[PDB]
Amino acid sequence: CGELVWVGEPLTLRTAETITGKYGVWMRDPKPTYPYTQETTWRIDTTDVRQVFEYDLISQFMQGYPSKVHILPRPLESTGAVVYSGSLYFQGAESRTVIRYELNTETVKAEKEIPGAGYHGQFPYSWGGYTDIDLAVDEAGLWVIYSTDEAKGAIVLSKLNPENLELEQTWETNIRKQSVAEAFIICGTLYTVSSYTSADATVNFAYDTGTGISKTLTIPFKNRKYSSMISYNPLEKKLFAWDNLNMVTYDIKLSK
């Protein structure tokens, strides 16, 4: 682990064929858990988002033929969901509740109202929408990024116990959530993306959970169609940026 020092140029990943009509944001598990593997893919059905497609083999994923279709027990608020350690973690629609849905048993194993978190457009990033609550995974596990009335719109982040969703540790930054386009976590440091609509953007803030200090940064971050979501995969050590149909990757290097 270490501080982020380099971000590569965006590299396009080959998009799966859209013939079967399933082209929502997809994700993999950075802690693959039997019966799944590092190659298992999940795709959120992009309405009242209620379906998640599961593809055991990349061959099936690229053909658009899921190995399993999960009907979620509640609707999703956002695409800021993550798969980690065998569970889908997502925000219930029109709520501040995070839900742990164990994928192979199709069982809700935990629910947690994030205390005081704004939802449904109260604390978005810089470009509106319902991005108030943002789940993230890094080398240490599961996190949630949000804000509260108490924090006055500043980014708040909490480390989540992946079994029962307890908030094991919480930090209040001094970074206004609305002042940045999105945030992600690498090795316990929160980073923010300055903008998705400026071609020559930056990673422009870093908040270190080991020190409680936020700093400005100017690491070049190139936007080459606008990305609508970004997610760090700590198993692959890359950022995955989604544009509503295609996925691009950004290689990263740390001060390891």
Author numbering: 245 to 290, 293 to 470, 472 to 503
Show sentences the authors wrote.
Olfactomedins (OLFs), modular proteins containing an OLF domain that are predominantly expressed in neural tissues, are involved in fundamental processes of cell growth, cell signaling and cell adhesion. While the folds are nearly indistinguishable [Fig. 1(a)], one difference is the presence or absence of a heptacoordinate calcium ion bound in the central internal solvent-filled cavity of the β-propeller [Fig. 1(b)].
In the case of myoc-OLFN428E/D478S the conversion of Asn428 to Glu decreases the stability compared with the previously characterized myoc-OLFD478S, reverting to the value for myoc-OLFWT. For myoc-OLFN428D/D478H, nearly all residues were traced; residues 291–292 in monomer A and residues 292–293 in monomer B could not be traced, although several loops in both molecules were difficult to model, suggesting overall loop flexibility for this variant as well. Among the well ordered loops is one encompassing residues 259–268, which is shifted ∼5 Å in myoc-OLFN428D/D478H and myoc-OLFN428E/D478S compared with the analogous residues forming the top helical turn in myoc-OLFWT [top and middle in Figs. Calcium coordination for the more likely variant myoc-OLFN428E/D478S was not readily satisfied by the available protein ligands or water (not shown). To support the absence of Ca2+ in the structure, we employed a strategy used recently to identify Ca2+ ions by anomalous scattering. Our data only reveal anomalous difference peaks from sulfur [Cys245–Cys435 disulfide (not shown) and selected methionines; Supplementary Fig S4(a)]. In sum, unlike myoc-OLFWT, neither myoc-OLFN428D/D478H nor myoc-OLFN428E/D478S copurifies with a fully occupied Ca2+, but both the Nematoda triad Asp–Asp–His and the Arthropoda triad Asp–Glu–Ser appear to be able to support metal-ion binding, perhaps in certain bio­logical contexts.
